[PDB]
Design a protein that fits this description.
The complex is a heterotrimer of chains A (216), B (13) and C (212). Chain A has 216 residues and is mostly beta strands. Chain A contains no helices and 19 strands. The N and C termini of chain B lie far apart (20 Å). Chain C contains 2 helices and 19 strands. Chain C has 2 domains: 1-110, Immunoglobulin-like; 111-212, Immunoglobulins (Immunoglobulin-like, Sandwich). Helix content of chain C is 5%, strand content 49%. Chain C has 212 residues and is mainly beta. Classes of the chains: A mainly beta (216), B little secondary structure (13), C mainly beta (212). Chains in contact: A-B, A-C, B-C. Chain B binds chain C through residues 1-2, 4, 8, and chain C through 29-30, 32-33, 51, 92, 96. The complex binds ammonium ion (NH4) (26 copies) and sodium ion (NA) (13 copies). The site of one ammonium ion (NH4) has 4 residues of chain A, from loops. It is classed as immune system. Keywords: Malaria, pfCSP, antibodies.
């Protein structure tokens, strides 16, 4: 079976370099061209160019002429994409894709490699309580502010409280940091007796926070 | 005109 | 893009839908090397049509394609939930180069409209005591998964300091989003109230909070 298998996610600072690999199997590598396609956040697929695997001649679309290099290593049937002097706007999922013929382009695709370029540095979150106070139920939560990189996970009362929990996907701020919130809906009658604690875990910074959320 | 069955990867020498 | 597609199309299960792809340049020449790709998020795109109308074995026979003039069309019949995805047309454009269309988001309307529920929290005293202030507007249980969010200081629009997420699919197949308004503590206390206004399918739900 034709397979194109790409290397894993990359997180880079501007100015850094990155090299994405695209390992093929199931066919003769030098028989078919290897193309590269990008998808930036909130954008569509964009054709970047291709390399001829018999001649080594690369073709770059405008927009990808200057800092991009297509290469390959026939000894391991692998194609590479190298980007010099990375920019924030290089942030995208990069795909390799084979062309079979002019009539049949991009018949097999790699699974994609996410390359994130950000000036942000690792940072644990600041956790603030979202104090309670429709109907007999009250909403309380935790604001998980200014962290990097993803991910964060939130539980409530060490996993004992699961019903009514809504943990929202993080917003990516212009500063490059993330913030998210988790909120739980509970009986208003319980606010006097039951303690509510959000358990925040940010592994990239080796930080955990248990934040007690009380009324007033 | 482009032949749809043609392979673009051919050595053009 | 060199190939123009509608940003979005929608249909109900069972219906047929068509997605157009119009060349804006004579670089396509005879425009007979048009292919289509289905793209589910986080997965590799999949070839579903090539040379305008050829559907390969291993692609669903509900996919078809045609062209008229410089407009190629993809048609999906017997619409099913798993057809929900992005769809891209693609053309050869001479001298061993290719180009993709801008993409079309296909929504399969598999459930009824659902208005968003909105919860708005003011800044916490702890954050205020750290000389920062964040309003938190949480938006849940809406369908279709598109909203726009506007903020107001009292009755006046506020655009500075607003960060809003894209909609994300919930486990119950409705959508959620959140929006954050960053203020100084002094801005927060200087107004009678702030409002988060969520617009969904032509109607608006607004929640208000006040320093006290
Ligand atoms: N593949
Ligand atoms: N590199
Ligand atoms: N680009
Ligand atoms: N290389
Ligand atoms: N090379
Ligand atoms: N190289
Ligand atoms: N390289
Ligand atoms: N770029
Ligand atoms: N063909
Ligand atoms: N593939
Ligand atoms: N940072
Ligand atoms: N996360
Ligand atoms: N806990
Ligand atoms: N997230
Ligand atoms: N731990
Ligand atoms: N609290
Ligand atoms: N053509
Ligand atoms: N199908
Ligand atoms: N599908
Ligand atoms: N595009
Ligand atoms: N719904
Ligand atoms: N508070
Ligand atoms: N505080
Ligand atoms: N909500
Ligand atoms: N706004
Ligand atoms: N669901
Ligand atoms: Na990553
Ligand atoms: Na650098
Ligand atoms: Na381009
Ligand atoms: Na070369
Ligand atoms: Na270009
Ligand atoms: Na924790
Ligand atoms: Na995707
Ligand atoms: Na086939
Ligand atoms: Na085929
Ligand atoms: Na669906
Ligand atoms: Na709510
Ligand atoms: Na803070
Ligand atoms: Na404006």
């Amino acid at each position: 079976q034709v397979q194109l298998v790409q290397s894993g996610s990359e997180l880079k600072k501007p100015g850094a370099s990155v090299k994405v690999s695209c390992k093929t199997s199931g066919y003769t590598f030098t028989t078919y061209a290897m193309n590269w396609v990008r998808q930036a956040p909130g954008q569509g697929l964009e054709w970047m160019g291709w390399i001829n695997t018999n001649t080594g001649n690369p073709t770059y679309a405008p927009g990808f002429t200057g800092r991009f290099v297509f290469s390959f290593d026939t000894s391991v049937s692998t194609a590479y994409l190298q980007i010099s002097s990375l920019k924030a706007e290089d942030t995208a999922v990069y795909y390799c894709a084979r062309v079979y013929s002019y009539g049949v382009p991009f018949d097999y695709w790699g699974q994609g490699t996410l390359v994130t370029v950000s000036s942000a540095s690792t940072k644990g979150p600041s956790v603030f309580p979202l104090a309670p106070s429709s109907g007999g139920t009250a909403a309380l939560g935790c604001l998980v502010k200014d962290y990097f990189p993803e991910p964060v996970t939130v539980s409530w009362n060490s996993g004992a409280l699961t019903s009514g929990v809504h943990t929202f996907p993080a917003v990516l701020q212009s500063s490059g940091l993330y913030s998210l919130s988790s909120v739980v809906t509970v009986p208003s009658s319980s606010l006097g007796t039951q303690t509510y604690i959000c358990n925040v875990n940010h592994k990239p910074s080796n930080t955990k926070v248990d934040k007690k959320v009380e009324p007033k | 005109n482009v032949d749809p069955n043609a392979n673009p990867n051919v050595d053009p020498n | 893009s060199v190939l123009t597609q509608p940003a979005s199309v929608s249909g109900s299960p069972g219906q047929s839908i068509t997605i157009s792809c119009t060349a804006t340049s004579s670089n396509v020449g005879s425009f007979n090397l048009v292919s289509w790709y289905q793209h589910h998020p986080g997965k590799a795109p999949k070839l579903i049509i090539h040379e305008v109308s050829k559907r390969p074995s291993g692609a669903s026979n509900r996919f078809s394609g045609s062209k008229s003039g410089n407009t190629a069309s993809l048609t999906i019949s017997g619409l099913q939930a798993e057809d929900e995805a992005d769809y891209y047309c693609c053309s050869y454009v001479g001298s061993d180069t290719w180009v993709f269309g801008g993409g079309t988001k296909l929504t399969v309307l598999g459930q009824p409209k659902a208005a968003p529920s909105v919860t708005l929290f003011p800044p916490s005293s702890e954050e205020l005591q750290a000389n920062k202030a964040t309003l938190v507007c949480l938006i849940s249980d809406f369908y279709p998964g598109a909203v726009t969010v506007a903020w107001k200081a009292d009755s006046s629009p506020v655009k500075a300091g607003v960060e809003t997420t894209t909609p994300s699919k919930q486990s119950n197949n409705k959508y959620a989003a959140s929006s954050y308004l960053s203020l100084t503590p002094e801005q927060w206390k200087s107004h009678r109230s702030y409002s988060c206004q969520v617009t969904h399918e032509g109607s608006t739900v607004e929640k208000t909070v006040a320093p006290t």
